[PDB]
Amino acid sequence: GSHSMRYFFTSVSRPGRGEPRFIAVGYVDDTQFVRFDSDAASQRMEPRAPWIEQEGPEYWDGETRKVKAHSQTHRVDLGTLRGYYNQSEAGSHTVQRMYGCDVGSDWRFLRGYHQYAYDGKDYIALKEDLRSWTAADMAAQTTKHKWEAAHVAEQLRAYLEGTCVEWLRRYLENGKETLQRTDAPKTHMTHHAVSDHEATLRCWALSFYPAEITLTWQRDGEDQTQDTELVETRPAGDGTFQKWAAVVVPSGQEQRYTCHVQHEGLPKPLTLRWEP
Amino acid sequence: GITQSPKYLFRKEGQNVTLSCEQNLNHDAMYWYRQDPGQGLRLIYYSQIVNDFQKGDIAEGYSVSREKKESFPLTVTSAQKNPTAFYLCASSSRSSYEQYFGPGTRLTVTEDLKNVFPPEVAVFEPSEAEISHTQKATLVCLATGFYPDHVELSWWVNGKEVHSGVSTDPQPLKEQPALNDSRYSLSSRLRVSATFWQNPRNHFRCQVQFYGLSENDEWTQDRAKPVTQIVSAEAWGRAD
Amino acid sequence: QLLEQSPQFLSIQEGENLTVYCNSSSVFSSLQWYRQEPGEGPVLLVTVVTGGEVKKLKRLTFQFGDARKDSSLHITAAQPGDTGLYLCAGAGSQGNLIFGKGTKLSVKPNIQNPDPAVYQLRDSKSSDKSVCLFTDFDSQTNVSQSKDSDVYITDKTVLDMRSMDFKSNSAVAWSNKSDFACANAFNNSIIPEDTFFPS
C-alpha cells in the first residue's frame, strides 16, 4: 500500500542560557532511520536503522552538511519570530518543521507536505496543490509575502514531487525485509469487575505494524462511545505497536458486545467476543 | 547594495590576501566567483545563511568566513598556482534565487616586484591628409609598457572630461603573449571635427591612472619606484 | 544539473533580429538572464518562473519553455549597445545558481559611406615616433594580428560621434623597428583594394 517519508525538526531556544537545542529525525513510515542532535558530541547525522548503515561516507557527509545548514536557519528563525511577536528575550520558544512525501501502491507521487509550527500552533503550511501557502496569522503573512516574492513554493514542488520520491523508492528497496513487511495484530480480551454491578471489557491488539489500526466496539444494539475509552497507539519498542479499547457493560451480558479490528495485515477484519 | 574593495590589488607570490564584500541588501545568501580570459564564472565558495558556508567547484587554496550577515571575506592563500583573476561577489535574498553582483576586484600576483612598471604615454596628432580627405581629425593615445594591467584611461579637452568621440580599447595588448608577466600597451582614439582641431587654443590631454606599488613595499632597483600615479600626455590645436 | 548555452559567439549587423538559447535536461523552478560587459559584474536582466511565460526589457524578449527546461533570449533590431556577454542561470538544488558559459554578442554598425584609408600620425613631442591609423573601413573587414613579433596591432574598435551622427571603425599599428612603414603595416590583413594611402 501507500508509503511515506517524513522529516521532523525541532528547535528550542534556551535564553540567557546559550545556544538552541536542535533535533532532527527522519522516518520511512512508522520506522525511524536517522537522527541529528545538536547536543550529542558527534555533530553528525547518525544511522538509526540497520538498512541505512549500508550508505557510504558521501551520503553521510552530505546529510551532515545539509542538516547543519537547517540548524543555523532554524537558529536565525527563533530570533526573527521573537521579533515578529515582540516577545522579550527571557522566554524559551519552540520552532517545529515537518516535510516529506507520500507515494501510492505503485510508488508514484501521491502527496506532499511542508509546514511549520511556533510555540505549538500552526504558523505556515504549503497547501495540497503545492502552489500556495496558508498563513495562520498576520506574522505568518510576512513570511508568506517573502516566500512568494522569492518563489520558494516552486522549488519545494520540484523536491517533493521529485527528489523526495526518488529517495523513498531507494530506501524502500534497501530496507525491503523491514519496510515492506506487515505484522497482523494479535488479539485478546480482558474482563474485570467495577466493584460489583457492572464490568469493563477491554480489547487488545499487539505487535502489529504499521501503526494505523481501527478498534471499535459494537453491540447487537449498535455503536456507542458510552465510554469506549481508546488509548493512543503505542510503540512496543521492538518495531511493533499496541492499542486497546474498553467499553463499560452491565455485569451479566458480555456476549452482546463485539470488538472489530481492522488492519492492513488482516486478510479479513477480526471480530472478537468474550469467551466466558 | 553590494560593494567590493578595492577595485585593483597586487601582491608578490606567496603573500596571502583577503578580499572584501559587504552588502546592505538584507540578503541571506552570498557567493564568490572567479573569471579568467574571455571566459566564464567559476564558483569558489558560498554561504546560504550566517555561520554556514560550503565549497563551490574551485574551492582549493581559498577560505571564507561568514559571521555577520553583511559580509563575506575571501582569503586567497598560497592556493593552487592560480591566483591572478577577476573576483566577483554576489548575494541573493535566499539561496538559489536571483543574484546581484558586486563590481568585482582585479587581483594580480607577480613573481617579483622588479616586474612592475608605469606606462609611458604619448599622443599622436592627426595628419594633414585625413583632415583634407574627411574634414575630421583623429588623435591617438598610446600607453605602453605597463605592468600590471591595472590602468584607467581618460581624455580631457580644455580642462574637462569628454566622452563623445572616444573609443578606448576594451582590452590591453600583451607586448609578449608568451610571458605570464609581460608588459602591456593600450590605445585610445578621440575624433573631433577639423575646425575644432585647427584652433590653436584647443588643448587635448590623454590621462592614465596607474595602480602599482604602495609604501607597504620597499624598493631597491636603480629606477624610480613604480607607485600608483597619473601619467599624462597632451597636444594642442594646429592652425594650418 | 546543467545549463548549455548556444552559440558561443554571435556577430550580427545593427538592425537585425536575434535569438539565443539556454537548454537543460532537467526542469528548473526559476531562471535568470544577465549581461556582462568586460571588467564589470553581470547585470541582472530578468527572472522567469512560469512555464510558457514571456517578459520584455527594452529590445529584449525572454521566454521560458512550457516544460521549464529551456529559455530563449530574443533581440529585436539590435544596436551596437546590445553588445556584451549573455548568461543564463537556474535555481540549484544545493542553494546556488547553475550557470551556462555564455553567448558573446557583437553588434556591428552599418557604415553608410566607407572611405577606407591608412594615415601616418606623428608624436606630439618629437621627431621620429609615429603610428598608422587604418580607419573608416566597412564592417566585414577583419584586421589580423601582426606578422612580425615587434610590430604591434590592435583589435578594431567602433568610434561614435553622435554629434555628427557618425560611426567609424579603426585600428592602430606601430613598431619599434626601422623598415616598418604605413604602406606595409597591415600586409597581414585582407584590406579593401580601394584603400587610400596618401604621399
Binding site: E63, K66, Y99, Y123 | - | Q94, G95
Partner: peptide, 9 residues
Amino acid sequence: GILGFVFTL
C-alpha cells in the same frame, strides 16, 4: 535525503 537549500522565515 533532506533539502539541499535552506531559507529563512
